[PDB]
Amino acid sequence: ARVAVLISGTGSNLQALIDSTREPNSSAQIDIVISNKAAVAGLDKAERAGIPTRVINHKLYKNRVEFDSAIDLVLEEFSIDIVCLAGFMRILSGPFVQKWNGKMLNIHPSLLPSFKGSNAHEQALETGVTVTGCTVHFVAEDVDAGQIILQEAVPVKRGDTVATLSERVKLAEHKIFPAALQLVASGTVQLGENGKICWV
Ligand SMILES: Nc1nc(=O)c2c(CCc3ccc(C(=O)N[C@@H](/C=C/C(=O)O)C(=O)O)cc3)c[nH]c2[nH]1
Numbered sequence: 001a002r003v004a005v006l007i008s009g010t011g012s013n014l015q016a017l018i019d020s021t022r023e024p025n026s027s028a029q030i031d032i033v034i035s036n037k038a039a040v041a042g043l044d045k046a047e048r049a050g051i052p053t054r055v056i057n058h059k060l061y062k063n064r065v066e067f068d069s070a071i072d073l074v075l076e077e078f079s080i081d082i083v084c085l086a087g088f089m090r091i092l093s094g095p096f097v098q099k100w101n102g103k104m105l106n107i108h109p110s111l112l113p114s115f116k117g118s119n120a121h122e123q124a125l126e127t128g129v130t131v132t133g134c135t136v137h138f139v140a141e142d143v144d145a146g147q148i149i150l151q152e153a154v155p156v157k158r159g160d161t162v163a164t165l166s167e168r169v170k171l172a173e174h175k176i177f178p179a180a181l182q183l184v185a186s187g188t189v190q191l192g193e194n195g196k197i198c199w200v
């Protein structure tokens, strides 16, 4: 399966994805990395790995749909089958999400449906849960509401901050996101026509 990874920031999840695709038994290959921002740390990881990079600055396009089309064009250029959102902070338009429905994955630093949004760790600490985690899910039009593929629970220790908690959760992210990508790219896991998750 041909995979595109969309980034906006650091990209440690990108690196974990890259490493798992170098495995001989991997069903996925990362053929292109796309960042909506220029000169972010993810582009260098992709260039160090030997993966083509393209920058599509959304602050240089008419609106959402137009900018999504510029991404879609690059995905078609590299014949992409699967899209991975690795810290990609742009809400994707209706038609884009619908075209790549059941073919686009995202990592979220909480045990969904708990703590949807931009600051899951902050929410988790404010609420006072002792167990949080991370979720890999198919991207639906509604934010963080797509079908769940994999989840891993991560303990919250007393005195935790966003710095320490995210550090611990990211260790789980680096596990389940490559694992989920493999499940999808191998055809083991797919989006069911009923809407739900289908195994084989
Ligand atoms: N349809 C759809 N569903 C999704 O789940 C999804 C995702 C997954 C995670 C996500 C969800 C919302 C925002 C988000 O709202 N970001 C806002 C602010 C970011 C910033 O200021 O940097 C934004 O829309 O720009 C950023 C990231 C990315 N794009 C998506 N598209």
Ligand SMILES: NCC(=O)N[C@@H]1O[C@H](COP(=O)([O-])[O-])[C@@H](O)[C@H]1O
Residues within 6 Å of the ligand: 009, 010, 011, 012, 013, 014, 086, 087, 088, 089, 107, 108, 109, 118, 170, 173
């Ligand atoms: N879009 C939802 C969201 O909050 N994404 C979060 O951004 C980080 C990117 O890490 P990385 O840049 O080191 O891969 C990840 O930890 C992920 O949970």
